[PDB]
Amino acid sequence: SSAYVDSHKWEAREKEHYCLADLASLMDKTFERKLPVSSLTISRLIDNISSREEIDHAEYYLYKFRHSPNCWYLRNWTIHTWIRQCLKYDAQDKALYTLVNKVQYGIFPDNFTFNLLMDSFIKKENYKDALSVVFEVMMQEAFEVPSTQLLSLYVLFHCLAKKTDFSWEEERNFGASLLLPGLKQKNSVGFSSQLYGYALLGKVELQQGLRAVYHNMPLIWKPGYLDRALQVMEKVAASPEDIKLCREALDVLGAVLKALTKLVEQLDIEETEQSKLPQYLERFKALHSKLQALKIESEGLLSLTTQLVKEKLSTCEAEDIATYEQNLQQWHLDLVQLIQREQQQREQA
Amino acid sequence: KAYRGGHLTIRLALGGCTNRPFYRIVAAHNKCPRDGRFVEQLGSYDPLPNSHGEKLVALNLDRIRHWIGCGAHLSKPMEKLLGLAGFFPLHPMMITNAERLRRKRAREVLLASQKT
Amino acid sequence: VRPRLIAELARRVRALREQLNRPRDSQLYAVDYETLTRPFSGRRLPVRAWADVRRESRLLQLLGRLPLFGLGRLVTRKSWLWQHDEPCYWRLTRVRPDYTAQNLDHGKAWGILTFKGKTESEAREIEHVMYHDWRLVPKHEEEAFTAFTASVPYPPLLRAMIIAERQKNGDTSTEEPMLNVQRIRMEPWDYPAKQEDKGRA
Amino acid sequence: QPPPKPVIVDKHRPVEPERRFLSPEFIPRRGRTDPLKFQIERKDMLERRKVLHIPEFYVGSILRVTTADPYASGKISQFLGICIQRSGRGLGATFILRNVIEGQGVEICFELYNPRVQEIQVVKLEKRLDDSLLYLRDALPEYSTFDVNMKPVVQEPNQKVPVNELKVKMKPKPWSKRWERPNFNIKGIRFDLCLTEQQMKEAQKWNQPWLEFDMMREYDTSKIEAAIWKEIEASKRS
Ligand SMILES: [Mg+2]
Numbered sequence: 001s002s003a004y005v006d007s008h009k010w011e012a013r014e015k016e017h018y019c020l021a022d023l024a025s026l027m028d029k030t031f032e033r034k035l036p037v038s039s040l041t042i043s044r045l046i047d048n049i050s051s052r053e054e055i056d057h058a059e060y061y062l063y064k065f066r067h068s069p070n071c072w073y074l075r076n077w078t079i080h081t082w083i084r085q086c087l088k089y090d091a092q093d094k095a096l097y098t099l100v101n102k103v104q105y106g107i108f109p110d111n112f113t114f115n116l117l118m119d120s121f122i123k124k125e126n127y128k129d130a131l132s133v134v135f136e137v138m139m140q141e142a143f144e145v146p147s148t149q150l151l152s153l154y155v156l157f158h159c160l161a162k163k164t165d166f167s168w169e170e171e172r173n174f175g176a177s178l179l180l181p182g183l184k185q186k187n188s189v190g191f192s193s194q195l196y197g198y199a200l201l202g203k204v205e206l207q208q209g210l211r212a213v214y215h216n217m218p219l220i221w222k223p224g225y226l227d228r229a230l231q232v233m234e235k236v237a238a239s240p241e242d243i244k245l246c247r248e249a250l251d252v253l254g255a256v257l258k259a260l261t262k263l264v265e266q267l268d269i270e271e272t273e274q275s276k277l278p279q280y281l282e283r284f285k286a287l288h289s290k291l292q293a294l295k296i297e298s299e300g301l302l303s304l305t306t307q308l309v310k311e312k313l314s315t316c317e318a319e320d321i322a323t324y325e326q327n328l329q330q331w332h333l334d335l336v337q338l339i340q341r342e343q344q345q346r347e348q349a
Numbered sequence: 350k351a352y353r354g355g356h357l358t359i360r361l362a363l364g365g366c367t368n369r370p371f372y373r374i375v376a377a378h379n380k381c382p383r384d385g386r387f388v389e390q391l392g393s394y395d396p397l398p399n400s401h402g403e404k405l406v407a408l409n410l411d412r413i414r415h416w417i418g419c420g421a422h423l424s425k426p427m428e429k430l431l432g433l434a435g436f437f438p439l440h441p442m443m444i445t446n447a448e449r450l451r452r453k454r455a456r457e458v459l460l461a462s463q464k465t
Numbered sequence: 466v467r468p469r470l471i472a473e474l475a476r477r478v479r480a481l482r483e484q485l486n487r488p489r490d491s492q493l494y495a496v497d498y499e500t501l502t503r504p505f506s507g508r509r510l511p512v513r514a515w516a517d518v519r520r521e522s523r524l525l526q527l528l529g530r531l532p533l534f535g536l537g538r539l540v541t542r543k544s545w546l547w548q549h550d551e552p553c554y555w556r557l558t559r560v561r562p563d564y565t566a567q568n569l570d571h572g573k574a575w576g577i578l579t580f581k582g583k584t585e586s587e588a589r590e591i592e593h594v595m596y597h598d599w600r601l602v603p604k605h606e607e608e609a610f611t612a613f614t615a616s617v618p619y620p621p622l623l624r625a626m627i628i629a630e631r632q633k634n635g636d637t638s639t640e641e642p643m644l645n646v647q648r649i650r651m652e653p654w655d656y657p658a659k660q661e662d663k664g665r666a
Numbered sequence: 667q668p669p670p671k672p673v674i675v676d677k678h679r680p681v682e683p684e685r686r687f688l689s690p691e692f693i694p695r696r697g698r699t700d701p702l703k704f705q706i707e708r709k710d711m712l713e714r715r716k717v718l719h720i721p722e723f724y725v726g727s728i729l730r731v732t733t734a735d736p737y738a739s740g741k742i743s744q745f746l747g748i749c750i751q752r753s754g755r756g757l758g759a760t761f762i763l764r765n766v767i768e769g770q771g772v773e774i775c776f777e778l779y780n781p782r783v784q785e786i787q788v789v790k791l792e793k794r795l796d797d798s799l800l801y802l803r804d805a806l807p808e809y810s811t812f813d814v815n816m817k818p819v820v821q822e823p824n825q826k827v828p829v830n831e832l833k834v835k836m837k838p839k840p841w842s843k844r845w846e847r848p849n850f851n852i853k854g855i856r857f858d859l860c861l862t863e864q865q866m867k868e869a870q871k872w873n874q875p876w877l878e879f880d881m882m883r884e885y886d887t888s889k890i891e892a893a894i895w896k897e898i899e900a901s902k903r904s
Contacts, residue, residue: 021676021677021678024674024675025676053675057673067565067567068564070564071569072534074533103529103568103569141603180605215520216522218601220603410626437620
């Protein structure tokens with residue numbers, strides 16, 4: 001969707017054309033006297049950038065703004081000025097570095113801007129960058145958007161193309177990321193991906209405890225992830241259509257390999273997951289048999305089923321475009337108020 | 350002595366020579382010394398038994414109620430004595446101490462029965 | 466009477482200097498995890514919080530990983546939810562991090578709160594922000610998490626005194642005297658306090 | 667995590683390019699002598715310059731210097747001071763430094779070619795309208811009172827010389843040099859407060875205007891300094 005990717009409006013709409021060196025000196029002396037500064041200066045700077053060294057200067061000035069007396073304002077239109085200024089001049093190393101150390105820079109793109117970024121990633125045909133970026137979106141917890149289908153495509157493709165058997169950080173990242181795209185409750189793909197994510201989270205718990213499940217990952221503390229997977233399977237068997245894939249075999253493998261032979265966060269009366277493994281496996285076999293007694297093709301490759309989504313993806317992209325023009329109109333409406341605001345100070349002087 | 354902040358407190362003042370303590374419940378500020386000045390002398394207490402075997406203590410009910418209505422905090426020994434008296438609720442730490450003493454005495458009797 | 470001016474001068478100058486160059490909140494909240502001693506103070510931490518300071522992170526460090534520090538996003542009082550099975554949270558309204566912090570991991574933020582599902586139409590300062598006892602709840606499992614549904618005799622001496630009083634008055638009043646206890650809202654320890662009431666070095 | 671790297675860029679076509687600057691001791695004195703003397707002493711100091719840098723400076727600049735003392739704490743001596751003047755030519759060229767410390771005004775005369783000195787450093791580069799600042803003795807101590815721990819004020823790589831056009835208050839009349847006369851032609855001081863209009867009228871008698879109008883005394887240099895420049899660049903290339 002080259003039309004969905006490109007947009008001449010942003011590049012040909014409301015350019016400032018001020019002196020980059022003058023703006024740099026102004027911002028430098030203002031941050032040396034460490035008084036607060038409006039986002040208007042950074043916005044005009046970014047709109048005026050036309051060079052790689054200038055984007056680097058802007059990166060350092062954005063770091064300074066993060067460490068400036070004001071940090072919360074976090075104007076999305078300025079964030080997207082920066083994002084375009086970086087991605088059109090092709091600094092993916094810089095984009096990825098900022099996006100991974102968001103705490104150092106604090107960039108937070110919305111649905112359409114992020115979908116543009118990830119579509120550029122598709123066009124350049126890279127996987128590791130997109131994978132790290134979707135992990136950072138898992139950190140964001142922003143999935144109730146038209147980019148949900150793009151996130152789903154990405155994860156469904158990369159979890160299959162990974163071919164990496166042992167990695168605890170990466171595996172926890174995958175297990176926690178496979179949930180949020182599926183909360184839209186759309187189809188077999190959705191709730192079975194939620195099932196597989198529950199399975200991965202329970203595996204991560206049983207192999208390295210519940211601490212990392214929540215410490216540096218926003219998750220729920222209920223240890224029964226296998227229990228929740230069993231609940232999901234039983235309610236699905238009770239209830240539509242369930243197009244299935246052989247990742248249930250991966251679930252079987254994990255369960256069997258865990259059944260194979262300090263601070264105490266677990267509650268005393270409630271049993272331990274180590275002691276629950278046996279009945280977990282018994283009920284898992286039971287639900288397996290019930291599902292096969294009840295859909296059970298396990299042939300349709302899930303990454304291929306994301307091509308079915310491309311059509312209604314091509315329908316919801318229109319809604320996304322419309323919301324983006326609404327955002328642009330709101331920005332152009334409320335931003336001019338801030339230009340007269342500086343005129344207020346200048347006329348007062 | 351104008352004490353900043355602070356608050357009035359009915360507490361025990363000590364009298365009598367060594368090995369003869371005589372406590373006096375009396376209202377005063379939180380910052381006053383032990384034997385420091387006071388406002389009104391409220392009551393007395395002798396931790397020693399008399400010729401009858403009992404020991405002595407006096408309470409000024411109406412005045413103490415007036416002081417509490419005016420607002421003054423209580424020290425743990427004096428409110429413990431009040432709770433033991435009955436004008437005041439009984440003390441939970443007193444209940445725990447009693448129960449611990451009874452447990453220890455039961456254990457001692459058990460050990461004596463074992464030895465015998 | 467002889468006046469004195471250098472005393473006023475010293476008072477004013479000390480007040481101005483301290484309110485100008487007081488130590489930063491992040492500076493005095495920083496903790497070294499291997500020794501468990503705050504800089505600028507040289508004080509040790511309590512044994513009950515040693516492990517939590519070693520393991521768990523701070524509120525602003527948790528809020529730095531999402532946009533706008535998560536307005537309306539669920540952070541729950543780990544202590545409240547370990548002390549009681551009922552859900553307790555914070556309707557965080559306003560946030561302000563400290564610019565001097567490197568990771569922007571310190572600041573001040575508050576809004577409305579709730580204790581065992583008893584929400585108040587009241588947005589007040591939080592209590593104990595700097596602790597390493599903060600737990601972030603996602604946006605999923607949100608509604609399920611947030612879902613939520615006489616008298617005592619007087620003392621014996623006091624009741625005897627009132628009996629004697631009303632007998633001297635003359636009325637029988639065979640009813641046993643009582644007081645209201647449903648009115649007395651005995652509040653648990655963990656009910657929060659007013660940050661501004663407590664000072665700062 | 668890696669530390670941030672601050673970088674500053676200043677792009678101004680008129681202001682950035684400054685072309686040339688010569689040292690005051692390469693040039694010879696009006697006296698007559700064979701230029702062989704000058705050229706050999708020049709190549710000597712230049713093949714020493716290949717080692718030692720002498721970050722160029724001016725009168726009124728703040729210099730920090732480290733030198734190898736024979737018998738001292740660590741056998742080194744570190745001194746910060748204001749440049750009062752640069753005197754002499756050839757290798758015997760020196761510069762004066764001064765600083766008020768603990769109420770005492772100390773001053774040294776550093777020779778800038780002796781191996782005993784280890785490093786020169788410019789904490790600040792500036793210029794006073796007066797070429798000679800010897801009146802800082804009689805000036806107030808607060809003007810000369812400088813910090814020893816002041817780290818270098820970052821200066822641009824290529825800029826014009828910052829000139830602080832200021833004036834200075836002075837100690838009362840009992841001075842040593844009689845700075846009031848027009849022979850020195852100095853303006854940093856404040857006559858209006860240092861003396862009376864009567865003293866101005868009384869000192870204007872020593873005005874000898876014809877000194878600057880005369881032209882057989884002045885010393886032309888253009889071709890000379892050009893030849894010295896070419897010798898410098900030839901020695902640098904070789
Ligand atoms: Mg003399």
